[PDB]
Amino acid sequence: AQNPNCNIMIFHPTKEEFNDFDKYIAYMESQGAHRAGLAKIIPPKEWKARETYDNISEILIATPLQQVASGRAGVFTQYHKKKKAMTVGEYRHLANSKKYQTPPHQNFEDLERKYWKNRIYNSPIYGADISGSLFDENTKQWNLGHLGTIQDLLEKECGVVIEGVNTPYLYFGMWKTTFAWHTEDMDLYSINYLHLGEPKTWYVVPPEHGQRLERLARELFPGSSRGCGAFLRHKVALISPTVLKENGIPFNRITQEAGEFMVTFPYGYHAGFNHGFNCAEAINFATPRWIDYGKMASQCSCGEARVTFSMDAFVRILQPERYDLWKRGQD
Ligand SMILES: O=C(O)CNC(=O)C(=O)O
Ligand SMILES: [Mg+2]
Ligand code: NI
Ligand SMILES: [Zn+2]
């Protein structure tokens, strides 16, 4: 069995190996990468996503989200308070202001310490979930706006044609902006490219151990767990590495830098935070190996998780017994 300790693997594809996206994902899996739940892919030196980032300031962040925490430093939830629209140039200036900027630090480990000590005492503003792309149309390799769609994958594997579309999303971050513990919708893969700026630190639980994280979460967030049998779908709960270690939960960590891709694998729980002003692009995707995870994915039906148009068909075809309850949660 490859990668039996479920370590995060780092790949350095050549320019030739960077041509065929599906083939390379399958290669990484042949080496056991999926066992970690997360892999890093460093693009060949010949590749670029676009020529420059000099002309992005006029992108609008229609609904910046202030991420307000409740709880204790290592075990907290966050809610998202909607703020007034602002441009990416305005948001960058805000990220760099004295109130929001990254503090002085020694290295990534010192910054990580500071994050977990102090995150709850601040409310950073995240420009998350913006439909769009920063890949140049002429970038042919690993262009997250040109991937095979999940609807096409389902059709190819299962024979059923379905409605829906699959487009990327931009994330503008600042120091302390946080992504809560989650798996993807329908336990899909994700791919995330850090276009520019400061790093993003990731934490991940191996897919084979995801239920250990869920059991801890039910213990640590007992009201939320009574409310919903899949409350991690709400994407609000944070648990620190220290707390995970105290509770024996297997996990790994890694820091993504600008110019690097991360892939999350089906049912790989992940969480993390941004080091300072940055911009990432991410999209969900599927492979043949995903289908069995999609059929077994948990679902939130309490109403909170509220998701895209395109999840309807996935539930309807892969999970027909759950469909009626889930759809009630959507309405
Ligand atoms: O970058 C973020 O805020 C969150 N990203 C993801 O969870 C992802 O790419 O799957
Ligand atoms: Mg612009
Ligand atoms: Ni994710
Ligand atoms: Zn729910």
Swiss-Prot record:
Post-translational modification: Ubiquitinated via 'Lys-63'-linked ubiquitin chains. Deubiquitinated by USP14 with the help of TRIM14 leading to stabilization.
Necessary cofactors: Fe(2+)
Binding of Zn(2+), residues: 228, 234, 300, 302
Details of cofactor binding: Binds 1 Fe(2+) ion per subunit.
GO molecular function list: chromatin DNA binding; damaged DNA binding; histone demethylase activity; histone H3K9 demethylase activity; histone H3K9me2/H3K9me3 demethylase activity; metal ion binding
Catalytically driven reaction(s): N(6),N(6),N(6)-trimethyl-L-lysyl(9)-[histone H3] + 2 2-oxoglutarate + 2 O2 = N(6)-methyl-L-lysyl(9)-[histone H3] + 2 formaldehyde + 2 succinate + 2 CO2
Binding locations of Fe cation: 182, 184, 270
EC class of the enzyme, as a word: oxidoreductase
Protein residues bound to 2-oxoglutarate: 126, 192, 200, 235
All copies of domain JmjN, residue ranges: 8-50
In-chain residues carrying the UniProt-annotated modification PolyADP-ribosyl glutamic acid: 16-17
Every JmjC domain range: 136-302
Keywords, comma-separated and alphabetical: ADP-ribosylation, Chromatin regulator, Dioxygenase, Iron, Metal-binding, Nucleus, Oxidoreductase, Transcription, Transcription regulation, Ubl conjugation, Zinc
One GO process term, biological-process aspect: chromatin remodeling
One GO CC term, this protein: nucleus
Intracellular or extracellular location(s): Nucleus
EC number: 1.14.11.66
Principal localisation: nucleus
Recorded family membership: Belongs to the JHDM3 histone demethylase family.
Protein task: Histone demethylase that specifically demethylates 'Lys-9' of histone H3, thereby playing a central role in histone code. Does not demethylate histone H3 'Lys-4', H3 'Lys-27', H3 'Lys-36' nor H4 'Lys-20'. Demethylates both di- and trimethylated H3 'Lys-9' residue, while it has no activity on monomethylated residues. Demethylation of Lys residue generates formaldehyde and succinate.
Name under which the protein is recorded: Lysine-specific demethylase 4D
Gene behind the chain: KDM4D
Parent-protein start and end of this portion: 11 to 341 of 523
